[PDB]
Amino acid sequence: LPPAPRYFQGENTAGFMRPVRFEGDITNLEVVGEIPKSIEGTFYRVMPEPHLPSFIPNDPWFNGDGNISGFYFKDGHVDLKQRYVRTEKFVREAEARRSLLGKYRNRYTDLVEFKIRSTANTNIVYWRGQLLALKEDSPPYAMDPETLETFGVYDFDGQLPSLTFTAHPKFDPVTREMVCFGYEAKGDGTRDICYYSFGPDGKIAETVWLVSPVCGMIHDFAVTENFVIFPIIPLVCDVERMKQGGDHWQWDYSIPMYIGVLPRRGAQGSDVKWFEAPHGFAGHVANAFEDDKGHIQLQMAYAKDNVFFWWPDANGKGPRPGEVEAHFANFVLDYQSDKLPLAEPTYLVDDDMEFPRIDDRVATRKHKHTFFCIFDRKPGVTDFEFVMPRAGGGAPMSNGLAHLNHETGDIQRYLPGPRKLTGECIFIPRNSEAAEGDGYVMVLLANYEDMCSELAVLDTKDLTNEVALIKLPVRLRPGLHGNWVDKSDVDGHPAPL
Amino acid sequence: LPPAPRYFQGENTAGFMRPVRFEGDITNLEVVGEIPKSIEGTFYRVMPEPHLPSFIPNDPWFNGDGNISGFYFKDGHVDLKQRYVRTEKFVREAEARRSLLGKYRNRYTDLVEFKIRSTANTNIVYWRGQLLALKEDSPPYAMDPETLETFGVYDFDGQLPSLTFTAHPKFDPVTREMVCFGYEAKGDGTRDICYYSFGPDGKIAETVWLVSPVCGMIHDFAVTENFVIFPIIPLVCDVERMKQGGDHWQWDYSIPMYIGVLPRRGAQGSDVKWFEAPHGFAGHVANAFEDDKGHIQLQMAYAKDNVFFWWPDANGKGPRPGEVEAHFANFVLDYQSDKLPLAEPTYLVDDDMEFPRIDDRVATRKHKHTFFCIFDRKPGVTDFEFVMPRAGGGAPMSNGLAHLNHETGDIQRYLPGPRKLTGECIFIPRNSEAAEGDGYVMVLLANYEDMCSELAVLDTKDLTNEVALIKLPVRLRPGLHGNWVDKSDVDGHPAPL
Ligand SMILES: [Cl-]
Ligand SMILES: [Cl-]
Ligand SMILES: [Fe+2]
Numbered sequence: 001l002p003p004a005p006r007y008f009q010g011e012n013t014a015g016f017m018r019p020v021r022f023e024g025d026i027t028n029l030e031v032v033g034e035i036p037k038s039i040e041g042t043f044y045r046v047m048p049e050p051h052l053p054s055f056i057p058n059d060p061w062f063n064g065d066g067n068i069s070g071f072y073f074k075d076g077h078v079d080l081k082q083r084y085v086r087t088e089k090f091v092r093e094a095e096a097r098r099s100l101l102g103k104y105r106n107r108y109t110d111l112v113e114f115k116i117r118s119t120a121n122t123n124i125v126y127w128r129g130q131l132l133a134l135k136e137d138s139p140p141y142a143m144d145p146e147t148l149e150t151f152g153v154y155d156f157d158g159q160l161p162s163l164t165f166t167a168h169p170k171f172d173p174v175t176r177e178m179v180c181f182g183y184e185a186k187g188d189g190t191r192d193i194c195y196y197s198f199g200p201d202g203k204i205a206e207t208v209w210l211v212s213p214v215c216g217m218i219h220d221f222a223v224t225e226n227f228v229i230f231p232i233i234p235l236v237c238d239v240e241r242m243k244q245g246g247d248h249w250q251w252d253y254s255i256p257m258y259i260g261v262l263p264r265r266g267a268q269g270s271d272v273k274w275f276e277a278p279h280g281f282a283g284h285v286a287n288a289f290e291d292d293k294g295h296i297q298l299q300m301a302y303a304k305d306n307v308f309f310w311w312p313d314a315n316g317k318g319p320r321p322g323e324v325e326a327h328f329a330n331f332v333l334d335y336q337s338d339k340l341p342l343a344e345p346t347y348l349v350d351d352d353m354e355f356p357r358i359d360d361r362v363a364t365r366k367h368k369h370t371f372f373c374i375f376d377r378k379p380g381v382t383d384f385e386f387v388m389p390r391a392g393g394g395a396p397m398s399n400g401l402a403h404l405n406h407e408t409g410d411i412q413r414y415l416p417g418p419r420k421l422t423g424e425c426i427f428i429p430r431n432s433e434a435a436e437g438d439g440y441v442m443v444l445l446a447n448y449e450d451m452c453s454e455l456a457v458l459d460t461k462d463l464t465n466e467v468a469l470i471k472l473p474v475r476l477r478p479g480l481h482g483n484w485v486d487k488s489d490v491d492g493h494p495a496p497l
Numbered sequence: 498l499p500p501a502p503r504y505f506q507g508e509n510t511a512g513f514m515r516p517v518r519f520e521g522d523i524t525n526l527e528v529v530g531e532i533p534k535s536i537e538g539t540f541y542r543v544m545p546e547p548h549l550p551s552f553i554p555n556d557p558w559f560n561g562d563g564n565i566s567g568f569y570f571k572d573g574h575v576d577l578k579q580r581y582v583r584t585e586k587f588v589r590e591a592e593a594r595r596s597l598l599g600k601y602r603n604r605y606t607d608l609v610e611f612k613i614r615s616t617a618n619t620n621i622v623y624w625r626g627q628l629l630a631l632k633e634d635s636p637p638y639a640m641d642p643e644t645l646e647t648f649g650v651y652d653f654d655g656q657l658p659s660l661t662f663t664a665h666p667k668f669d670p671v672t673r674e675m676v677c678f679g680y681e682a683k684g685d686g687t688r689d690i691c692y693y694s695f696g697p698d699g700k701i702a703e704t705v706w707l708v709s710p711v712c713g714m715i716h717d718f719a720v721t722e723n724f725v726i727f728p729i730i731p732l733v734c735d736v737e738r739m740k741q742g743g744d745h746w747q748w749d750y751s752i753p754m755y756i757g758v759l760p761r762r763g764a765q766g767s768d769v770k771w772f773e774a775p776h777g778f779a780g781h782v783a784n785a786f787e788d789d790k791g792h793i794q795l796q797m798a799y800a801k802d803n804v805f806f807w808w809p810d811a812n813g814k815g816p817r818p819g820e821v822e823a824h825f826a827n828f829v830l831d832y833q834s835d836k837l838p839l840a841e842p843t844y845l846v847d848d849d850m851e852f853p854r855i856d857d858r859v860a861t862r863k864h865k866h867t868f869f870c871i872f873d874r875k876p877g878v879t880d881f882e883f884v885m886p887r888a889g890g891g892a893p894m895s896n897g898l899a900h901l902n903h904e905t906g907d908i909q910r911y912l913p914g915p916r917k918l919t920g921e922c923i924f925i926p927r928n929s930e931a932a933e934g935d936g937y938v939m940v941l942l943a944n945y946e947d948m949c950s951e952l953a954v955l956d957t958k959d960l961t962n963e964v965a966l967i968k969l970p971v972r973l974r975p976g977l978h979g980n981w982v983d984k985s986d987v988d989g990h991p992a993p994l
């Protein structure tokens with residue numbers, strides 16, 4: 001077998017990116033300032049964190065084992081619980097005490113045959129009394145919200161129609177449905193998309209099979225009252241490339257960014273319209289909604305080149321690190337229109353941004369507040385001379401949060417400091433009676449001075465000021481998505497406005 | 498109540514001394530080099546580590562909650578398990594989410610009435626299938642060797658005759674007895690010493706009550722074939738001082754270092770002879786044995802002034818930090834002699850040293866190998882300019898290990914490097930057939946460059962070279978005592994030579 005390294009080597013595991021790989025508890029975290037005593041609930045986030053050194057050199061960040069963090073808040077105190085998802089990968093590699101899974105989404109490089117290849121490392125959501133740890137190439141893994149015990153791969157009581165479950169399901173605040181899909185839904189390289197939904201009682205509602213024009217990556221999607229929208233990233237899969245040991249994904253400069261629109265209820269596969277946006281990268285969806293005219297407003301991060309530059313085109317052509325900016329874009333779509341090409345989007349702000357969150361009480365409906373990560377290259381904002389040597393590589397960088405009020409156009413920016421970077425934030429309603437976007441924001445900071453992580457608590461009345469700063473004595477590796485589960489919400493999700 | 502701080506402040510909890518307070522697992526630790534595959538067993542060590550910020554300012558290091566580390570070795574792989582002892586203190590403070598226990602060994606400063614005040618933070622030993630977490634003001638806490646679950650305060654099936662159990666019991670390799678004592682054995686300020694032993698079947702054997710000439714600290718003791726020896730540190734307790742909120746311990750310049758000698762078997766309390774060594778500080782015992790003439794050779798660390806300088810004499814007089822050196826001393830005692838004063842000891846080496854270990858297969862018998870910590874002020878050995886600002890305070894410093902061969906007089910010194918310090922080492926016999934002192938040495942390093950801990954594995958054939966260096970991604974706070982439990986030893990203790 002390929003030799004198993006006994007320590008981590010390479011840029012993707014250097015400095016702040018060095019795996020810690022701890023599981024357990026740290027109760028009564030140190031706090032500077034004061035956590036509002038009314039806050040009660042749990043912040044769950046997931047990070048890729050290789051449990052064992054890969055036999056693949058420069059294994060991408062996206063291929064690390066999912067490690068779940070829970071920050072449990074009550075009465076101004078907070079405890080951390082941390083535990084790896086017991087994926088098939090995790091368990092079998094733990095038995096062997098060496099890495100066995102090979103390249104990202106390429107089973108032909110694995111040292112053993114896996115049934116499920118999930119690292120469960122992308123998102124962690126709450127559904128009907130369980131956590132679901134998500135990875136878009138696989139079904140969810142179900143976990144206990146209290147102990148972070150892994151129950152196992154989850155198939156919704158045998159109802160799951162797809163081999164794949166998106167990392168970005170949407171929760172309708174009115175109907176209390178979880179709206180889902182999977183791409184490559186019948187296996188590697190398939191153009192099959194399965195759109196499906198679950199009612200609050202756990203019964204499957206919608207199940208529609210449709211066909212993608214290309215086998216492209218559909219990372220995120222959008223849901224409105226009457227439509228579901230599938231933006232396709234021009235990364236394309238060829239299984240024959242994979243069989244020769246090549247990458248699952250390869251950029252294609254010759255295609256548009258397809259945006260499929262399907263009726264949300266009662267549709268057939270052939271009812272999908274594949275609109276054609278200008279070539280670019282479909283980033284994370286903030287939210288989508290129907291306006292007065294019945295037109296879809298789709299607000300999402302959008303770049304003009306390949307953000308995932310480590311998967312270039314067939315001739316190795318692509319941007320360099322730190323080159324590509326994504327911007328907060330608004331696309332307009334009309335399902336009635338027979339004109340497939342779409343106009344260039346309008347931009348809501350000028351900042352290089354990603355990881356947009358809204359007040360999920362208005363998800364699928366008109367929203368007027370968005371919180372998002374920003375990366376500002378203006379000199380001084382980040383002390384790059386200090387940070388970059390300590391930072392390692394492989395992971396996106398963010399040096400502030402921004403709050404956009406869509407009505408007024410006002411923007412507040414939180415800047416943690418010159419030697420700190422941020423992850424994706426969460427929004428917490430101040431209480432069940434709070435106005436849209438009124439409450440608290442939490443964000444995990446990497447502190448490159450201390451080589452420690454911190455959890456910042458902000459009040460939306462003044463996003464520039466930290467109300468509290470929770471000081472972890474360990475590093476939490478840069479992660480991906482996270483969610484708030486409020487104690488006052490029985491089903492784990494906030495009530496509609 | 499006195500206000501509970503919500504983060505750690507002061508020198509005793511700054512830099513590398515900042516509490517981490519994690520419990521759980523890190524499996525498959527990173528290794529540079531190669532762990533000998535024949536090594537099979539567990540290295541247990543304990544560190545004081547406050548779970549909650551004290552309401553006592555500048556609470557000494559010795560008063561922190563006991564946190565147990567286990568390093569489990571097999572086939573060249575190693576896993577870490579870490580868990581706090583569930584003392585009464587730990588449990589009740591965890592319930593309240595604030596500190597409740599007050600000053601070191603002073604119940605009159607506690608905010609609630611404790612039955613047991615142990616932090617169980619001094620030593621961790623193996624006895625009849627359990628770990629015993631030790632603190633000399635209390636009975637042991639029993640723990641599971643595999644899971645580090647706390648069973649509870651342990652009284653040896655109701656046989657424990659003393660309120661107190663030494664942190665330094667001795668294991669006779671021939672008789673398989675655990676030889677014990679407790680001082681202040683009938684409560685605060687009492688001069689009662691209880692000497693007791695347990696046979697390998699768990700039945701109590703010896704129980705002898707004797708009287709100390711002063712209420713002084715007896716931290717360590719020594720056991721020979723026919724005698725037990727009690728060196729008294731000239732720190733003295735006055736309960737009336739304590740009732741006014743004063744220190745449990747206070748140095749007394751006017752007394753000798755008493756060294757009691759009692760027959761090991763069949764004695765009465767009045768059979769003890771209190772010999773009088775020159776005034777000084779009784780450090781840790783390496784080992785003691787009877788020579789051919791029947792004279793006791795007592796080898797221990799010995800200083801000429803108060804090592805615990807933070808507890809000065811009645812007028813506040815004492816040495817400053819880093820001033821007092823301890824030296825590896827040999828005292829000669831004859832139980833037959835009626836001459837109470839003892840001659841100055843001979844010194845075996847010139848190094849400033851502490852934390853002596855022997856090959857415990859010859860404990861209570863003639864030994865000819867000793868391993869010990871050293872602190873070398875020779876320029877360059879420690880980069881103090883770099884380390885001291887990162888080090889915090891309160892904890893003893895050691896910048897190497899030394900191996901003394903007592904026959905040849907040869908000394909090897911392990912120096913981890915200019916920006917690293919060491920804790921107490923363990924010795925592991927190479928196998929059940931190995932000669933005295935032949936095998937492996939392990940020692941936990943604090944790496945001030947990375948602000949991480951490392952576990953070094955050395956071969957006794959060349960102590961200057963690291964065979965393996967296990968790289969922890971977290972800090973383990975400077976700790977106290979630790980022990981090896983070999984898998985090949987049924988009762989957890991090595992077989993006699
Ligand atoms: Cl589990
Ligand atoms: Cl326990
Ligand atoms: Fe994502």
Ligand SMILES: [Fe+2]
Nearest residue numbers: 619664781978
């Ligand atoms: Fe000790």
